[PDB]
Nucleic acid binder design. Structure first.
Ligand SMILES: [Mg+2]
Ligand SMILES: [Mg+2]
Ligand SMILES: [Mg+2]
Ligand SMILES: [Mg+2]
Ligand SMILES: [Mg+2]
Ligand SMILES: [Mg+2]
Ligand SMILES: [Mg+2]
Ligand SMILES: [Mg+2]
Ligand SMILES: [Mg+2]
Ligand SMILES: [Mg+2]
Ligand SMILES: [Mg+2]
Ligand SMILES: [Mg+2]
Ligand SMILES: [Mg+2]
Ligand SMILES: [Mg+2]
Ligand SMILES: [Mg+2]
Ligand SMILES: [Mg+2]
Ligand SMILES: [Mg+2]
Ligand SMILES: [Mg+2]
Ligand SMILES: [Mg+2]
Ligand SMILES: [Mg+2]
Ligand SMILES: [Mg+2]
Ligand SMILES: [Mg+2]
Ligand SMILES: [Mg+2]
Ligand SMILES: [Mg+2]
Lengths: 52, 252, 121, 233
RNA sequence: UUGACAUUGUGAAGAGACAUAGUUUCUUUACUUAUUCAAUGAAGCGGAGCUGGAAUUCAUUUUCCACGUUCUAGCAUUCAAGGUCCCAUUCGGGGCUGAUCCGGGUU
RNA sequence: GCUUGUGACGGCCCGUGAAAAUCCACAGGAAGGAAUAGUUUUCAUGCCAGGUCGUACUGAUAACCGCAGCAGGUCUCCAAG
RNA sequence: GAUGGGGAAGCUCCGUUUCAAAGGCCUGAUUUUAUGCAGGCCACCAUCGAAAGGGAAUCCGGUUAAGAUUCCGGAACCUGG
């Protein structure tokens, strides 16, 4: 693997020669939704901490 | 006289533990700021077979409090914990099959496994497949907690001492007959050099106390006193009774 | 005044001043003269009826070389002692504690000449 | 404000790697450190006797400074001065012919343990200074006791090396005096007076009190908030 | 194995004699500094304060609690972005703050 | 078809059947780089260099061990009709 | 199986990260000069131990009385610079 050219060890997408695409699919969606739901839980307990 | 088999297991030359394949030492997380003030999360990334242990282990990976990295733990998987699951460890942590909690922190009657004797000793009691300790109630001031170890004994230990919710997996393994010599053979092949065993009374006086005589018999009480000397303690050591257990045992 | 601040739990060795060595008598008065000069490197020419068959039909010199010497030392001293140039060197140890050498000369030179220049045949 | 943002950091368990702090209190010191530290500790925990612990009662910066002042006016000869005395008395006295006394009488601080102690015994010392360091403490502990019995004023100064400098050594343990040029003779008694205040007179009263017995703060604080609750309901 | 003596110190309740003053001796139970057991690339201990808040106020607090993370098999590092102050305005770079004080007993 | 190699699978276990060097990628974005001229030596092509020791042959009804040119013993690969 | 240690009258025994202040790289700092301090990493704690385990890279033809994946011819490949 050190006697061969860089594009024998990657596919062009992020996390190339590391994870299996369908696996990258997941960490995208999970990341977004969570960082989104991490925000849904901002207001909700901003509201409990100002109206209980 | 020779030196009897059960003396030679001491300098353990062929008598040690067959240790090559074992996944590592099963131990609780070291007890730090997280667990003793709050809680912390890990993911069980794998539960796997240990060679020479009846119960599955669970590999449970965490973050590091004080450096950017990961830290990886070997737990004994309490029955039900699963890959991907989240695991919590600490004082203010929850009551679910798999988290680790100070003994004070669980309502009396809970069920915990791999539980410390002294806090922070990182695991100690109820670790075999199927075993657990039940809690029978706490002592508010001087923070103790009385429990019932699998042997039925009732020991009192710290409430800061940690346990983990549930019974241990792989239970009931021993309800199944080993059936032939071979399965026994392999069983102990991965454990240590104890099998097979040769009835003392099959050998010669050199070899044993039970050894010798024109008939295969023991010749004297096979109940040997506590304060016996190495070379003597063979047979039923220090027994306070003997004979077929009639009636209901069970702890009181 | 006030104290120090250690950001690390660990206490390492005070990386202090390691000083030079400056004598007062000499190591050894008079140093040793070069132990393996060219003349001690290659010792004798090997003159088998099959050693010449190498020189004749192969452009290959043969030498009994001092065991204490490698290829780098043979090639340089074959060069220096015979004013020639070497293609490659093969060495073996003979079953009597002597180190043979199958020296080979570049496409230019002719061993045979170079052989009975030094005077053997 | 411009293209810049503010998004602090949640250092609160289970998130965000802890920032580097001053772990100064939690460092695994070298064993040689532990030893000198815990020896200090060990020394304070016990109930140290009155023939010792009657040390720990040093002088004070004020009264001491005045004694370091007055005693510097009586340093011993340096190498220079003595060799200089030599030739100013070599050719001088060996030719000019004096009774070896074309040379002045010197007025200087006496020192060196065995020196000072013969002095106290001959009632000739007039003010003795005692170190508070001396790790072989048995070398000097009998000096306060002695001075009192020989009716001689004394005081335990802070520093064994500080005494040293005013005598041209590294360390001197004890300095003392028998001579004093009459220019100073008066300021001396104004020193000896305050000296006899904090030491020579307090000595008998001092011999009754056992030092130490002090708790570590984690302990004192524990007990301070327990002998507080069992009494005030 | 079981006793005594040494290692062996410091408190209090109760007893033991000169025969109902405390120098001394033990039954019970406290102290940490000797000794012993454990843990960790000695990481957050102990004391005080902020904040809230359960608390009921018997002049104001007479107190006890807490005092950043829980639908998801993601991400979490460059003394940190922010704020603010300096170096004589370079690119670079330093304090303080962000991260409450006090004691240096790692727990 | 024989031998061997390899695959996708299936049975088996209170047995679930090594470790280390080493090599690759990845996340990360400290940095460093363009218009009159930079960036590239994981693309191609070109240059020098690779030391030391073993290397014969026997491996057995005679090259090993059995007092020996001993009907004994002594790990293994290839294997036609 | 050395080391810091701890045992042992002692030959030695114990322990291998263990009650130890254990150690070294990427480069910046020189433009008195060769290598100190400046950063920041790393706390990795010896070493020996497989010619059947792990493992960078070679092939065909020709040649000797006896060597050859080793020489010769020809065609490759790996590592370091
Ligand atoms: Mg590709
Ligand atoms: Mg073992
Ligand atoms: Mg056996
Ligand atoms: Mg049997
Ligand atoms: Mg028999
Ligand atoms: Mg017998
Ligand atoms: Mg018997
Ligand atoms: Mg018998
Ligand atoms: Mg029988
Ligand atoms: Mg060779
Ligand atoms: Mg076959
Ligand atoms: Mg499998
Ligand atoms: Mg290239
Ligand atoms: Mg080299
Ligand atoms: Mg051969
Ligand atoms: Mg033969
Ligand atoms: Mg034979
Ligand atoms: Mg050894
Ligand atoms: Mg090796
Ligand atoms: Mg191999
Ligand atoms: Mg051939
Ligand atoms: Mg030949
Ligand atoms: Mg052959
Ligand atoms: Mg190259």
């Amino acid at each position: 693997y050190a006697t061969v050219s860089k594009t024998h060890k990657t596919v062009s997408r992020a996390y190339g020669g590391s994870r299996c695409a369908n696996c990258v699919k997941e960490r995208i969606i999970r990341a977004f939704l969570i960082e989104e739901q991490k925000i849904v839980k901002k207001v909700v307990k901003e509201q409990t901490e100002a109206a209980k | 006289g020779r030196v009897i088999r059960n003396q030679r297991k001491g300098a353990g030359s062929i008598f040690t533990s067959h240790t090559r394949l074992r996944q590592g030492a099963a131990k609780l997380r070291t007890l730090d700021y997280a667990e003793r003030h709050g809680y912390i999360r890990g993911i069980v990334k794998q539960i796997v077979h240990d060679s020479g242990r009846g119960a599955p282990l669970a590999k449970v990976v965490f973050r590091d409090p004080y450096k950017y990295r990961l830290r990886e733990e070997i737990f004994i998987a309490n029955e039900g914990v699963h890959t991907g699951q989240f695991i919590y460890a600490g004082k203010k942590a929850s009551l679910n099959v798999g988290n680790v909690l100070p003994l004070g922190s669980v309502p009396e009657g809970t069920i915990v496994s791999n539980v410390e004797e002294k806090p922070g000793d990182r695991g100690a009691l109820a670790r075999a497949s199927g075993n657990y300790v039940i809690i029978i109630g706490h002592n508010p001031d001087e923070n103790k907690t009385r429990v019932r170890l699998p042997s039925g004994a009732k020991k009192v230990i710290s409430s800061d001492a940690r346990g983990v919710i549930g019974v241990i997996a792989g239970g009931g393994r021993v309800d199944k007959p080993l059936l032939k010599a071979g399965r026994a053979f392999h069983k102990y092949r991965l454990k240590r050099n104890s099998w097979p065993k040769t009835r003392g009374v099959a050998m010669n006086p050199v070899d044993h106390p039970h050894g010798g005589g024109n008939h295969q018999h023991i010749g004297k009480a096979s109940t040997i006193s506590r304060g016996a000397v190495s070379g003597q303690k063979a047979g039923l050591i220090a027994a306070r009774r003997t004979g077929l257990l009639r009636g209901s045992q069970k702890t009181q | 005044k006030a104290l120090k601040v250690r950001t690390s739990a660990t206490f390492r060795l005070p990386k202090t001043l390691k000083l030079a060595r400056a004598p007062k008598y000499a190591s050894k008065a008079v140093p040793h003269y070069n132990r393996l000069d060219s003349y001690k490197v290659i010792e004798q020419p090997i003159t088998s009826e099959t050693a010449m068959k190498k020189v004749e039909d192969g452009n290959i010199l043969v030498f009994q070389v001092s065991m204490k010497a490698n290829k780098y030392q043979i090639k340089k001293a074959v060069k220096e002692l015979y004013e020639v140039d070497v293609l490659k060197v093969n060495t073996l140890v003979r079953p009597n504690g002597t180190k043979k050498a199958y020296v080979r000369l570049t496409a230019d030179y002719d061993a045979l000449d170079i052989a009975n220049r030094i005077g053997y045949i | 404000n411009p293209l810049t943002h503010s998004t602090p950091k949640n250092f609160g368990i289970g998130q965000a790697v802890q920032p580097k702090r001053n772990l100064s209190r939690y460092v695994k010191w070298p064993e040689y450190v532990r030893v000198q530290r815990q020896k200090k500790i060990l020394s304070i925990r016990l109930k140290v006797p009155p023939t010792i612990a009657q040390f720990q009662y040093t002088l004070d910066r004020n009264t001491a400074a005045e004694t370091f002042k007055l005693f510097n006016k009586y340093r011993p000869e340096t190498a220079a001065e003595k060799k200089e005395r030599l030739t100013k008395e070599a050719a001088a006295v060996a030719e000019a012919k004096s009774k070896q006394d074309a040379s002045p009488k010197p007025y200087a601080v006496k020192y060196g343990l065995n020196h000072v102690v013969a002095l106290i015994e001959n009632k000739k010392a007039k003010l003795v200074l005692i170190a508070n360091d001396v790790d072989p403490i048995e070398l000097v502990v009998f000096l306060p006791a002695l001075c009192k019995k020989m009716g001689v004023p004394y005081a335990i100064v802070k520093g064994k090396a500080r005494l040293g400098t005013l005598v041209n050594q590294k360390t001197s343990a004890v300095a003392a005096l028998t001579e004093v040029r009459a220019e100073d003779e008066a300021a001396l008694a104004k020193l000896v007076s305050t000296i006899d205040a904090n030491f020579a007179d307090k000595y008998d009263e001092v011999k009754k009190h056992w030092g130490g017995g002090i708790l570590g703060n984690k302990a004192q604080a524990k007990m301070d908030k327990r002998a507080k609750n069992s009494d005030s309901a």
